[PDB]
Amino acid sequence: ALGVALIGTGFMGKCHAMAWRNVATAFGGLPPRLEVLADMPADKAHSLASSFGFARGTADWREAVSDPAVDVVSITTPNGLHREMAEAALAAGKHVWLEKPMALSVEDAQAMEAAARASDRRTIIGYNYTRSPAFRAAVDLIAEGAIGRPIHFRGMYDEDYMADPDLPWSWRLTRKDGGLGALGDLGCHLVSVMVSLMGPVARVYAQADTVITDRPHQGGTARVENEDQAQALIRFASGTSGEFSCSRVARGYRCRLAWEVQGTEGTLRFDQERMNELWLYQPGRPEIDGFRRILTGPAQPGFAAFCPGGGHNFGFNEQKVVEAEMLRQAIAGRGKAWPDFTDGLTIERVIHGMATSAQTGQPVNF
Amino acid sequence: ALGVALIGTGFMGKCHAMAWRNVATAFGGLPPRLEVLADMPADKAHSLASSFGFARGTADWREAVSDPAVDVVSITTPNGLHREMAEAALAAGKHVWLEKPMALSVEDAQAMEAAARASDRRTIIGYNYTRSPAFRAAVDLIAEGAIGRPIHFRGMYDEDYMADPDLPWSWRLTRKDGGLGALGDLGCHLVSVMVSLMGPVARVYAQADTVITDRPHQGGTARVENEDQAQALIRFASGTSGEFSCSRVARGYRCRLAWEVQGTEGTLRFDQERMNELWLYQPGRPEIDGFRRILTGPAQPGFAAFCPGGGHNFGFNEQKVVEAEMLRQAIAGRGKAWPDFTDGLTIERVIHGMATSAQTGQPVNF
Amino acid sequence: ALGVALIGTGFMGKCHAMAWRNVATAFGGLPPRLEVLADMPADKAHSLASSFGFARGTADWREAVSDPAVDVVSITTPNGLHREMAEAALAAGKHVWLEKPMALSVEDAQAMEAAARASDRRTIIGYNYTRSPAFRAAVDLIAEGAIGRPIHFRGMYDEDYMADWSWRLTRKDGGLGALGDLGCHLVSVMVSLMGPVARVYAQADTVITDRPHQGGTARVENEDQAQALIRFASGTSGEFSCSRVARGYRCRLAWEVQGTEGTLRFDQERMNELWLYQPGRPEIDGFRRILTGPAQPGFAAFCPGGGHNFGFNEQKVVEAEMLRQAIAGRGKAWPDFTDGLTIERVIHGMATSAQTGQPVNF
Amino acid sequence: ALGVALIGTGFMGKCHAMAWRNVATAFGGLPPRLEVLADMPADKAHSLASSFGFARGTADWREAVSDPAVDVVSITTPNGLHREMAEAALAAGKHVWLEKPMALSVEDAQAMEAAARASDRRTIIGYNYTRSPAFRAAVDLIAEGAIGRPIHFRGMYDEDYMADPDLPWSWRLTRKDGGLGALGDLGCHLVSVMVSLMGPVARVYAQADTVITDRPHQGGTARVENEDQAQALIRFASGTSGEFSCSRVARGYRCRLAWEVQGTEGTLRFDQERMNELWLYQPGRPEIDGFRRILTGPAQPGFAAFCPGGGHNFGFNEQKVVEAEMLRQAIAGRGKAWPDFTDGLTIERVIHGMATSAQTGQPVNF
Ligand SMILES: NC(=O)c1ccc[n+]([C@@H]2O[C@H](COP(=O)([O-])OP(=O)(O)OC[C@H]3O[C@@H](n4cnc5c(N)ncnc54)[C@H](O)[C@@H]3O)[C@@H](O)[C@H]2O)c1
Ligand SMILES: NC(=O)c1ccc[n+]([C@@H]2O[C@H](COP(=O)([O-])OP(=O)(O)OC[C@H]3O[C@@H](n4cnc5c(N)ncnc54)[C@H](O)[C@@H]3O)[C@@H](O)[C@H]2O)c1
Ligand SMILES: NC(=O)c1ccc[n+]([C@@H]2O[C@H](COP(=O)([O-])OP(=O)(O)OC[C@H]3O[C@@H](n4cnc5c(N)ncnc54)[C@H](O)[C@@H]3O)[C@@H](O)[C@H]2O)c1
Ligand SMILES: NC(=O)c1ccc[n+]([C@@H]2O[C@H](COP(=O)([O-])OP(=O)(O)OC[C@H]3O[C@@H](n4cnc5c(N)ncnc54)[C@H](O)[C@@H]3O)[C@@H](O)[C@H]2O)c1
Ligand SMILES: O=C1[C@@H](O)[C@H](O)[C@@H](O)[C@H](O)[C@H]1O
Ligand SMILES: O=C1[C@@H](O)[C@H](O)[C@@H](O)[C@H](O)[C@H]1O
Numbered sequence A, B, D: 001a002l003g004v005a006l007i008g009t010g011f012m013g014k015c016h017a018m019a020w021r022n023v024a025t026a027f028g029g030l031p032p033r034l035e036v037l038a039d040m041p042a043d044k045a046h047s048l049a050s051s052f053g054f055a056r057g058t059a060d061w062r063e064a065v066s067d068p069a070v071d072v073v074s075i076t077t078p079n080g081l082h083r084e085m086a087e088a089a090l091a092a093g094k095h096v097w098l099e100k101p102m103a104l105s106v107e108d109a110q111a112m113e114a115a116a117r118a119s120d121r122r123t124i125i126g127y128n129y130t131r132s133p134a135f136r137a138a139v140d141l142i143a144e145g146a147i148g149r150p151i152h153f154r155g156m157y158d159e160d161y162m163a164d165p166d167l168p169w170s171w172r173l174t175r176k177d178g179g180l181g182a183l184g185d186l187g188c189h190l191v192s193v194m195v196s197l198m199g200p201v202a203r204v205y206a207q208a209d210t211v212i213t214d215r216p217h218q219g220g221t222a223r224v225e226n227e228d229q230a231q232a233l234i235r236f237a238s239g240t241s242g243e244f245s246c247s248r249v250a251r252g253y254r255c256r257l258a259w260e261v262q263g264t265e266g267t268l269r270f271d272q273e274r275m276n277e278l279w280l281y282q283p284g285r286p287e288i289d290g291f292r293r294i295l296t297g298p299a300q301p302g303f304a305a306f307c308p309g310g311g312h313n314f315g316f317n318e319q320k321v322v323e324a325e326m327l328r329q330a331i332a333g334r335g336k337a338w339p340d341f342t343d344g345l346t347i348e349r350v351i352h353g354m355a356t357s358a359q360t361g362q363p364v365n366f
Numbered sequence C: 001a002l003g004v005a006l007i008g009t010g011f012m013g014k015c016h017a018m019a020w021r022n023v024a025t026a027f028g029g030l031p032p033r034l035e036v037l038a039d040m041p042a043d044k045a046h047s048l049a050s051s052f053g054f055a056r057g058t059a060d061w062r063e064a065v066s067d068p069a070v071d072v073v074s075i076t077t078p079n080g081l082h083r084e085m086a087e088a089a090l091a092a093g094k095h096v097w098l099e100k101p102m103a104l105s106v107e108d109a110q111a112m113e114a115a116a117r118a119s120d121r122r123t124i125i126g127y128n129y130t131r132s133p134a135f136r137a138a139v140d141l142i143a144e145g146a147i148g149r150p151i152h153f154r155g156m157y158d159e160d161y162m163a164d165w166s167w168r169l170t171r172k173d174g175g176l177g178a179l180g181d182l183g184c185h186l187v188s189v190m191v192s193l194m195g196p197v198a199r200v201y202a203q204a205d206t207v208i209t210d211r212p213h214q215g216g217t218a219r220v221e222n223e224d225q226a227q228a229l230i231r232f233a234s235g236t237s238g239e240f241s242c243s244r245v246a247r248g249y250r251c252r253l254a255w256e257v258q259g260t261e262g263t264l265r266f267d268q269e270r271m272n273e274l275w276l277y278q279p280g281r282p283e284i285d286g287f288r289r290i291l292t293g294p295a296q297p298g299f300a301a302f303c304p305g306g307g308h309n310f311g312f313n314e315q316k317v318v319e320a321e322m323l324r325q326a327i328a329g330r331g332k333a334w335p336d337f338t339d340g341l342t343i344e345r346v347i348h349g350m351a352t353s354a355q356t357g358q359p360v361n362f
């Protein structure tokens, strides 16, 4: 059994815990051993280690990564801690499952990437929207020739978790200790999807805005320093075009990662708010010609491991169980885990190049 | 910790196993101890015990049910075995989580109901479409007067798992194993939902059909004895009207449990194939008047235990985690499990009453 | 060129006026001449005759039906006047485009059916939801075997216009309530898909008993919703409902045909989409959204490019054209007063069934 | 009554003819007199004159624009004839209803705009997607504060009429006698809508592609000179951001002019393939929060002239009737029509500006 350490218990932390708990239930083999859970404060770590099924909890993440009973470390902490935690786990000889984005800067991601290549350990980054059966089905349909050659990509990622101007300021909204805004939180997810469909990015031209520039801060206010929304025109290395956007102030949207690939022989379209649906157009005889609604079921990758009947909606959290299985397989020397820290660094360059472009008014080439 | 025995490992067996594994992760407390898994043959039971995380496996279900390390039994076997397994578990002093429908006949269900009442143990039946955040939010909305007084119910449950006439004669067919056809497999679910929204059923007038009358059975052909579809007009105890249907041959549908409640001051509409959407109409100013798409999120019951952010789709399997929690709380005495075997018996009477009506061409009163 | 009389200028009167005005624009041949428009009061009839392009307006409907320049009479008045006006038009030697439902009772419709046969003139009833390109495409798909054998029909017609005074609420002017105003439409579609009805078991309700803003007593005299189970003459099953109090819905005439080899589904609120399921390879399996376009009957007379949405009013231009071709002996219009009589028997049989709590066989 | 001349009888000629015939039926006043129809050859003009209800047909469009019984001229011919015909009509003292785009080039458009200015006759260009009740309702909602201040526009116009590579080459696909491709045929429509919602365009950065570069050309093949698709980032005069695309090779789309306006207090979204629906999000209480589907009815501008009952779908052709009415009222001195040749020249500058941006890889400021 794989020995597991988990750092953090929040949105992604609990998602990781659920994932590691059921990965063998879904996919077979030996259940991973849930060894050490790290979180703060300590009594929360202890309480949650009990209910999560971990052998023990600790408030010291360094203890978790060095434990001799641990083979792999899930890292779900705030972005500013990612570099230090991943580098320590790799230095301790542990495989790493790091939540996105890799870190605050390209410089940090470059160091992480060299550290991963220096260890002989597997890494995967938590781009969970690449794990849905519908997304994986789309990739396989394209690889099967279902839509011919992609000629255009249009993608967006809209949410409104910051749309309320009275939500408080935080150091996450500074460049120095928050890194990127919408591009860092949501943009990187869209890039992960985008490059899986279209291949590498060659050029971006971007624009960005801070829509709510000031927020409540301990009686007065403080300045929001990173972007609430951004958009970019893409030229892929292949020569094909792309449209790209993200926003954390797009009112009414909650997880609207939506993309489409228009090809020479068809079109694929997806919206994460309805993650069980994949829309596929292929030319057909005029009397019946039209897009097909493909409802997620056992014909799509991964789904059969959770349910034998179609239309029993696959959930957001189950994307994480798939992601866990990919890592287990990679550790065991079968499949590859995508993206590792090398593949991840590329994604980091793209989002930071979009930010640089928006700042400078000039395109950025890769 | 509650000691768990699980009988069966198919569609629902694995779903229960996943639910028991993650119930404390989601809702806190102590994780249940996964003690014994029973399945046949023995080889498979030991293999699945290992991957599901159960302390041992056996091919002898009777032994599992009377293991003193077990407190509660999940029963996920075909319908013809429910009665015998449930009565034995209850006789051994074990709580029971029973898959729907209760058994083959109303008489079977009355027996099971009596055994449950005599045992003084908690029961819950696997009507998991009553556990979605959207459904539970709908019930609360109705109670709050969001749509006024209900004036009409229209419900359906379409799937196509038997639509292909080449599918071999399996279990769900005939009177052994399955009992009723679409009414037993799907209709029962629709009733569980319907009565939760509208209250008890006073009268039904029904019709039914067998659309595919024969199937391949190991080189011969065997007759299909139960119904592929059925429809009924309803009068509820309230006086309100209802329409009701189910089908296992409705081509293109996979899990189309869909319902709407029309009221004096609005309308609620839902489709399980998009189980994260609840449609609500309430009167508004003419310029902005229309149905609202309510996307599932932490405002709805149960969701916040799985994810803090709205629009991260809740899945089919997570309904079963919610059901596990309701059973835990009921066992601990902090809540009511619905439906228990008594509540379940009423559901059985409704579906069998519709069968009677379809056979006689006469309405059936309750 | 057909000479046209139009009686009534409301919802349907204006729709007929626009249909007659553009039938030749869309389908060729000679533009119909708009001869006489009848409505009350007279000054309204004069005004609308001018703007609609009719040679005259009159407050006397008999004046419209007796005009020698008229070949065909559109009757778009309240239901209580349909019988008298249609019988007079037919006696006068005019073809008749009659709004649904036929009249107030089965007896009325029987008298009208006999009159139509005696007159040797074409009739058509205004069941305009049978005229969409999507609907006509569906009928043809079913005839071609695209969904195999129909095994179940489920239809509904929800609107909410009564949930918030109309002659529709009286038995002398409207007749039946929801069954008469909306039910008949769903019947026209249902029988066109499934064939004739053999049996109904029905139920009904009045939810709003009195119009609360009328001041004086304003008793709603007929049903607000009804539902039925159907057996078709084929033996196949059906579900049927209608409502004028289903809040949020405005023209939700929605139906599906579940076949042994596929399913077709439609909702009039998105009248340009027809959903077709047929089994396919596991990897691509699912319903197709067929967007209305020139491959569908009638569309190409209005637009050569797919996806430019066909409108409700354009259904009426198609209806007019069907009448025009029937008059010229080039096709049969559906439904004539004989086909329409059967539809009346169905909705009135549903009403009887709901009153008695008993099934009604046809 | 207004005396009408109509030049051309194709897609738009028939659409204009239907509009002229029903404009007084819908909106009152006097029916326009259908005086002269022009098309080639003569047999075709005489036949269509008869069926469209025009007093006469001719093969000589000059005679048509010169007739003293004509007050207004509908020009629905191919793009390379617009300028000559429009200048001739204005010089003959006639009002003009001109199909989009204005001409092949900005220079032609400047010249036509100069002619119009000196004419004292009314002009309107055929931007019919600005005439839907939904679009007009959206514009009014934004003015009323329904979504607060706009903070992002995203628009697209996908069709697939050129997607098949075996469709034969033609001179419209030459820059000389075709002008722009997808920008000229579809892009201009999207600009018309975009500027009406967001205000004037201040800056664009664009890219464009020809996807199918060569098409069967009697015997051999030949070259396509203008673009199949184009995308742009926008800054409006308000400072607000935008995304913009068009394509004539986007498979499965037929008339997918779709746009979205995200504001500080809400979101509006529309797709012309479902032209009777307008989606409006405004913040709501957590239990009922979500987008409203506004179905087109008499509450929206123009609808009541065609039907008194909501939900009876307004069609594409009826947009043209509304456009006819606006011109009618402008001729009567009872309201300015939009867009006239001055307003339209700005739209032409935008689309040609995007083409210039795409060719240079440089932003273009207006
Ligand atoms: N892949 C996705 O879909 C996705 C979704 C949401 C968030 N995220 C990512 O997950 C990470 C955390 O986001 P969240 O929304 O889960 O945040 P959160 O605040 O919900 O959770 C952060 C967790 O880290 C813990 N933590 C903080 N400092 C710590 C320390 N020094 N030692 C141990 N634990 C510590 C917190 O107590 C908490 O349990 C971020 O990188 C974020 O981008 C990814
Ligand atoms: N609530 C729901 O959503 C839902 C969904 C699917 C099925 N079900 C119900 O679950 C039950 C089983 O359905 P399924 O689809 O999981 O069937 P299945 O055929 O997938 O699984 C049946 C399981 O029972 C086992 N079994 C049979 N006889 C046994 C015995 N004597 N001892 C031990 N194990 C035995 C089989 O090996 C198998 O593991 C049925 O009652 C059905 O109505 C419920
Ligand atoms: N096919 C459809 O989709 C559709 C839609 C609406 C109405 N209808 C039907 O069309 C008919 C008319 O309905 P409506 O909604 O247009 O009603 P309406 O009230 O809008 O119009 C009725 C018209 O009849 C006129 N009228 C009344 N008494 C008259 C008389 N003695 N002489 C001349 N004119 C008279 C009224 O002034 C008015 O112009 C009804 O039978 C109704 O069922 C059909
Ligand atoms: N607003 C819209 O939604 C919309 C839709 C389609 C086309 N258009 C525009 O309408 C115009 C026409 O496009 P179409 O699709 O109708 O093309 P088309 O080829 O269908 O029609 C052009 C018409 O002009 C006629 N014509 C050509 N040369 C002529 C001459 N010398 N004299 C008289 N008539 C002549 C043709 O015979 C034909 O009847 C274009 O400018 C196009 O951009 C607008
Ligand atoms: O309980 C069930 C449904 O959930 C499920 O959707 C069906 O496919 C199964 O056959 C049925 O047993
Ligand atoms: O014909 C009719 C329907 O088309 C229409 O939808 C209803 O609103 C009308 O009341 C009815 O008379």
Ligand SMILES: O=C1[C@@H](O)[C@H](O)[C@@H](O)[C@H](O)[C@H]1O
Pocket: C305, D159, D161, D185, D186, D189, D254, D255
């Ligand atoms: O104006 C146009 C669009 O409305 C229409 O949708 C396209 O098909 C036409 O090519 C274009 O001329």
